Write a protein that binds this ligand. Structure first.
Ligand SMILES: NC(=O)c1ccc[n+]([C@@H]2O[C@H](COP(=O)([O-])OP(=O)(O)OC[C@H]3O[C@@H](n4cnc5c(N)ncnc54)[C@H](O)[C@@H]3O)[C@@H](O)[C@H]2O)c1
Ligand SMILES: NC(=O)c1ccc[n+]([C@@H]2O[C@H](COP(=O)([O-])OP(=O)(O)OC[C@H]3O[C@@H](n4cnc5c(N)ncnc54)[C@H](O)[C@@H]3O)[C@@H](O)[C@H]2O)c1
Ligand SMILES: NC(=O)c1ccc[n+]([C@@H]2O[C@H](COP(=O)([O-])OP(=O)(O)OC[C@H]3O[C@@H](n4cnc5c(N)ncnc54)[C@H](O)[C@@H]3O)[C@@H](O)[C@H]2O)c1
Ligand SMILES: NC(=O)c1ccc[n+]([C@@H]2O[C@H](COP(=O)([O-])OP(=O)(O)OC[C@H]3O[C@@H](n4cnc5c(N)ncnc54)[C@H](O)[C@@H]3O)[C@@H](O)[C@H]2O)c1
Ligand SMILES: Nc1ncnc2[nH]cnc12
Ligand SMILES: Nc1ncnc2[nH]cnc12
Ligand SMILES: [K+]
Ligand SMILES: [K+]
Ligand SMILES: [K+]
Ligand SMILES: [K+]
Lengths: 461, 462, 462, 461
């Protein structure tokens, strides 16, 4: 008689389970952790509030934490990223999960609250796993007392790490965190190659547009912008890249992309005259990858070529000024998560109007909203780090320290390189790759242990 | 004219060298931007720089930038095969002491470095060092330790040289501070990677004119040089396999679309022929070493390689390949300079029509510089703008004149501040005609940076 | 009003299908340009076209172009899994007879084709045929030969269908002329190649969501489909190996940077398990058949494949893979529609956690249409502009009205003239915003062409 | 005392011979024919006038023809394409060759005349091997009586085939020809992949310019244009393609290139007003690939970005209006086959002028002029076809046939597809590739012999 959950359709559980069994065969690092730690039950007594896209891959993450002793209460960190069959399989396993594809904003907030509260009272949570910082923020702002029992937060993504570092800088972070994002087997795997796999995937599912031969503008060239640009270039798009960081822009040039600004002289003065209208008027597809605000703004949207596709693969939908489009332009749903935005006005639209844009996932994370996000074998790296980070902070028992000791232990850190390498080795073996072993003479020659780590912490890969 | 303080292959190549220097200047906007920015201030007035780095056209623009900012220099190459003789000639013709030519012997290589250290039989009053690989740094510390008392710093170009500096610092044997120029992003992520992408397949074509498309390559290493090398070959249509000891680098190779293999069965290098994956090596048409390590293409691998395979090294030192084994056991047939057929049939003489040979490029020395011209000017622009900024910083710091307590606080091996890295990158981007967008105040506040940068924390890996 | 002459999955999907048709029209400038150019002339007035081709959104735009030019049509899909139900619904809601849905049984497939042939229980007075693969053409010749007496021509879409027509022509059993639409350059070297580049990786991702980067693929065939398929996988970072029986196609694979291998030791398929290269197949994560031939992924290959490899076919018919062997011997577990795990442990049930299975896509039917949506509109634009021109040409030639003696002289399988191929291509290029240069009179004289084209002799291969 | 030759430096012969021995190991199809036909001596009595780039690869061709029984007299078909060590090795082998890198136009014609004449009188030639048609034209226009004894021409390249078809159309072709160019193992190997290998090779050797991130315009997208565009795109250039053929342009789009015209709306009205100055002002590299005339014209050259590189990889230098540059602008030699063209005026230049273009090989075929042309393992296919073509026409004995039989055989034809396949099979095995053998049932299913041919003559590959 389990009822502590809410999903779209519990009868999808059997399908979800079939895809979970397949995903386990694609996630050797994560499954290897089940075997390595199962006997030791390192998460025995952990009670984890988790907030991250309720996909099949997150299902394998959840069942790994439970297999190692944890109790969890789960929600998705995006209104469109849940795979309903994954949520169903997790619920059917007796695990509290509150998540479905297509939540309203109000439902999204309610779902997080259902993880925080059990039977109307704060759950006795002692760990947090977060993707983007929304659950972290709610706890700090609305349930600060619960943080007195929490040993740490393990944060998945660049945006959530930024929010943690803001708190650390201001002295408002109440518990230590692991920056999972900046393991190399996360940032340079998930953020880059994951978007390479899933960006063109989502655009095809949403529009079925030919990409070869067409013009794309990618805003940003950090890890997601790099992966996104490659997702498009490898399909034969002519990709142009915009950046505010000259080092990232230099990489784009060397990688064979033309670097351009939406604005004359690169100066974003807020006027239509600033827009390079010739450039925007030839762009068939714009993708925002920045984690910044309004990098595809109203004047850019006004200038875009007719029938261009607009999408965002950064964490939050405010990269694109969708608010402007809601206020001024008529939205025509093609199918779920695909809207034609008619620039002729707000008072209805002509069904045969030619002056529209296609917006994907209403501006939300497009790879998860219009497809299934990153593939299992990539998420294997990210989520193996998550499990190790949960063990790392839980075994350190920060919440049991006195305030003076807490002050010394309060930090936002990445996992040690040795763990990063351990994850990477399992990933390589999953491809059938064979890593060479240094001879003692060679290890001595370059000043490393035969067991690693093989690089200093400053190395950038 | 009157000036005799140099040794180059042929001073009459100078005019040709000058024509190419003028072209290179137009390909190096960051470096020439610094030349124009600092010319009036002469920030290197009084600097006396010992330089040891490949005497290419690109190094020529670097040398003449340092001189234009007020420095005096004495130069040598850091590799026996990497000099461009017309570049050396143009520098010498400018009245600049330079001792370098393509095809030095080891003895002549050492002699050239000593000629920069000595002027008229006695130590020059040097006070700065620019090095690439650490050979000059090593000779100063071991044979001329007194000279380091007046030297304010070392600016070191490359991964191997930085490693040697960090070992000395840990041991307490480094006598002057250094700037690690290699680990600017506009160096490591530009020079080490994209430079080898440009120049590896370039050197293999000049040396052999072999078709690469459709053939099998094994790249040993997947750090920055191995990444660029692997791309240099894959973009030509090679089927590239990658070897690594570092599982994170191996993971990148897999995701980048390469099969990761080991020359040894199960990756175990126990020094026996039985450990060699002979089936694998018997299929490889080209092996490239990129590691900075020792003996990563060893005797047993060379014995097992497919007949007529090409063997080369793009790491700093030739000991990546066991060429000494090949000198001792096999007969070398020079095809043309820096290209040898190595006949595995025996030591004394060979059949001119023998089919069982390997082709070795540049005698195992850095192949891009040995068989072609190294990285192109527009890439070296980033590396060498960093060098100029590094020379200015350490010369103005005046380490050798500081009190002992201040010396102890500044005796380190450090990179340049990220703000300067970004300023070099901006000039490189403009050189492509790229346009960098400026953040609005709100956007800068939103991500927690200044509109002027720096745009990333120091931990950021790009 | 009272239209019931159709059968589709769900007529209430029509509004959705119409939304997607309106989008597709903006992606199909060559086809819509023909609709605008010929609509007033009504060149297909009086044409009654039996159509058998994948009932997709793209086919919807084709159907409504033919109708807009004056034709009546009766339509079915040429594959049991390729219909898009919202496309079929939109066409039915427009009052056009269509009999098609995704997931037909073989019996239903045949019934749908017969519903186009028969109207109210009697042969429709058809006078034109548009086919993809030859199934409708075969049924007419075998079962309804009297209907062919009134048919002016067949316009055939695909390589396999063209092969079947040429067999009939050489055997003296072809009853009406055909236009080989496949071998327009704007079809074969657009649709067959780039279409599969777009849609093969698309279908694999939708069916499995597997990471492709770093994994091993074997592509059987390197014709136009095999070329596009190999690129679909290589651009994702797969390590792709290619098999071929044609040495010229194999030469291209090598030069394109693929390793060319055979499933069989030394390429010799003697029918025994012993001839299988078990080491090779035990490394393969994905096999794709692209040949139009029979049993190119056979029972012994399936037995040797790496555990959990994906198996799929993008050639026209499912007999490229020996699925019958798998139905007879192994247990099938449906993951979701058109995705099956085939458990090699036995036929009678399976362990849900068994690790020894293959994943078969679309039950071995055309995978890009079965697990995704086939080629994109802007590619199908070229193919279907050729179809419309071909229909116009054969309809206006009125073969069925000729005396027997003249029929004999007119019976042929021909391609469209190059000038029309070029005109289709020009509209495609304009759709990308490309700008074609016009020859000066002197340049056209210099190379021996008219300024307006055709620009190449008929022998040119592009 | 063999002295019937003219080369730059006979002392280079040992070096040339070392490189020929290497090249033999890279040319399995050509060397396979040499070993296969040595016993039969099918060219015994053949006296071949040869005119084709005197490279190491041509050396292996020459020695194969001689090994099969032919006598030859040889010249290069371009003033810059000879490898002097290849010429020296051939001369030191006792074979008449008149060729060096850097001939004048007058010397170029002298070298061809030296092959035609022996001891001051027409040689008793009976076969022609040509590349570009210059030797063919000299024979038809200046030595027509010699064609009475000649059995055929085997023509290497697109431009030369065009000239043969013009002569055939006009009734002026006096002997039959095999179009070697349009074997698939030539046209779709040499013309495309050869330029892919050797275009960026030659630009690097001439300029050492970084190509990544820079803007290129390739004029033409036939086989040479396809291979050239790939040569630049694989280095990271942003490549734009121009074409007059919309089918070739369609391919360029699908291959991921932006298709543009130097002229507004594609219309060249001969004036500067028709030039897309904005486009050409952004181009760093222009490469002509057309076989046409004046496709990089004076107004384009005036509008190009300062310091742009200009080169031609089509057969003849008139693709670029170098005549205009010689008349109006000052040429500064950087090094052999590399000139700065100073647009400041005709009479002298400032050594530090910034307004110049870099011209490679004085507009002559750049891959052969500034590098070594195609690699041996590509030229293997072309030159195997050459040997088969020489054998076929020599054995047909056209010169001896009665007039009515000549009429039936006066044609320009390709080799049979079976031979094309057999060349390709040897090339594939040179890579270690393994071709699968059809079963009898499969051969019956697709209607081919197990031995091939596998495709109808209409197939385009
Ligand atoms: N959708 C996914 O699956 C996924 C995966 C990982 C991360 N993310 C999210 O994507 C975003 C980016 O992540 P990241 O790791 O690439 O971060 P990053 O810091 O590496 O890169 C973002 C880049 O955007 C650039 N940028 C900022 N403002 C800009 C502007 N106005 N114009 C142009 N460029 C601008 C910055 O210079 C920076 O290089 C974050 O929100 C992160 O959480 C999404
Ligand atoms: N030729 C050039 O122009 C050029 C340019 C830059 C640097 N370099 C030199 O190239 C070398 C590599 O530089 P880098 O920046 O790439 O260093 P790096 O530390 O980034 O990469 C070297 C890689 O080699 C790997 N490796 C070590 N031993 C190995 C073994 N036995 N088998 C396989 N892989 C092994 C390491 O794991 C590492 O990833 C250095 O010597 C550097 O000075 C040359
Ligand atoms: N799914 C799609 O959207 C789509 C699109 C176009 C065509 N097709 C179909 O795909 C098939 C291939 O069409 P195509 O145009 O590429 O034909 P093609 O003739 O160009 O190529 C087929 C290739 O298969 C090779 N082959 C034959 N038997 C082989 C064997 N046993 N092993 C290895 N290689 C073998 C042949 O040598 C040939 O090169 C046909 O059935 C065609 O109708 C499908
Ligand atoms: N350098 C080499 O090694 C090499 C190798 C093979 C052929 N070639 C020569 O290169 C030239 C091209 O050969 P190909 O086989 O590619 O011929 P091709 O006929 O296949 O291609 C030439 C292309 O140029 C296009 N073209 C013509 N005029 C044009 C114009 N004004 N603007 C734009 N495009 C235009 C044509 O439409 C055509 O597609 C010939 O001269 C051939 O002899 C050189
Ligand atoms: N498939 C996925 N599951 C969970 N988080 C993700 N982030 C990106 N892709 C994801
Ligand atoms: N290397 C080469 N030798 C002869 N002819 C060629 N045409 C192109 N490259 C060539
Ligand atoms: K997924
Ligand atoms: K250089
Ligand atoms: K589609
Ligand atoms: K060559």
């Amino acid at each position: 008689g389990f009822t502590d959950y809410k999903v779209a359709d519990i009868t999808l559980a059997a399908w979800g389970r079939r895809e979970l069994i397949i995903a386990e065969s694609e996630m050797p690092a994560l499954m290897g952790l089940r075997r390595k730690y199962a006997g030791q039950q390192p998460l025995k007594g952990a009670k984890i509030l988790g907030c991250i896209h309720m996909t099949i891959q997150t299902g394998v993450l959840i069942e790994t934490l439970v297999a190692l002793g944890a109790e969890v209460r789960w929600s998705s960190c995006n209104i469109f990223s849940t795979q309903d069959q994954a949520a169903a399989a997790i619920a059917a396993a007796g695990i509290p999960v509150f998540a479905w594809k297509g939540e309203t904003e109000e439902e999204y907030e309610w779902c997080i609250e259902q993880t925080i509260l059990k039977d109307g009272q704060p759950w006795d949570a002692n760990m947090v796993l977060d993707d983007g910082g929304d659950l972290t923020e709610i706890l700090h702002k609305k349930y600060p007392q619960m943080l007195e029992r929490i040993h740490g937060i393990t944060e998945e993504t660049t945006t959530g790490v930024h929010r943690l570092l803001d708190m650390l800088k201001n002295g408002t972070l109440k518990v230590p965190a692991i920056n999972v994002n900046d393991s190399v087997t996360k940032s340079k795997n998930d953020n880059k190659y994951g978007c390479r796999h899933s960006l063109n995937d989502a655009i095809k599912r949403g529009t079925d547009h030919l990409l070869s031969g067409k013009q794309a503008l990618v805003i940003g060239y950090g890890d997601v912008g790099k992966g996104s640009s490659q997702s498009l270039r490898q399909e034969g798009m002519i990709v142009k890249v915009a950046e505010v960081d000259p080092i990232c822009a230099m990489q784009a040039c060397m990688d064979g992309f033309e670097v351009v600004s939406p604005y004359k002289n690169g100066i974003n003065d807020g006027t239509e005259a600033s827009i390079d209208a010739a450039l925007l008027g030839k762009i068939d597809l714009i993708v925002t990858t920045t984690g910044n605000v309004n990098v595809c703004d109203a004047n850019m949207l006004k200038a875009l070529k007719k029938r261009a596709v607009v999408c965002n693969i950064g964490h939050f939908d405010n990269e694109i000024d969708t608010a402007f489009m809601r206020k001024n332009w008529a939205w025509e749903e093609v199918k779920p998560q695909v809207h034609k935005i008619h620039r002729t006005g707000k008072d209805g639209f002509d069904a045969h109007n030619d002056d529209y844009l296609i917006l994907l996932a209403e501006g939300r994370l497009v790879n998860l909203g219009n497809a299934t996000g990153h593939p299992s074998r990539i998420m294997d790296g990210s989520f193996a780090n998550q499990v190790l980070a949960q063990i790392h902070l839980f075994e350190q028992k920060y919440a049991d320290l006195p305030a003076a000791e807490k002050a010394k232990r309060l930090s936002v850190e990445v996992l040690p390189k040795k763990l990063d390498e351990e994850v990477a080795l399992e990933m390589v073996k999953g491809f059938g790759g064979v890593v060479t072993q240094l001879t003692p003479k060679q290890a001595e020659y370059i000043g490393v242990s035969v067991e690693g780590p093989f690089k200093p912490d400053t190395y950038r890969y």
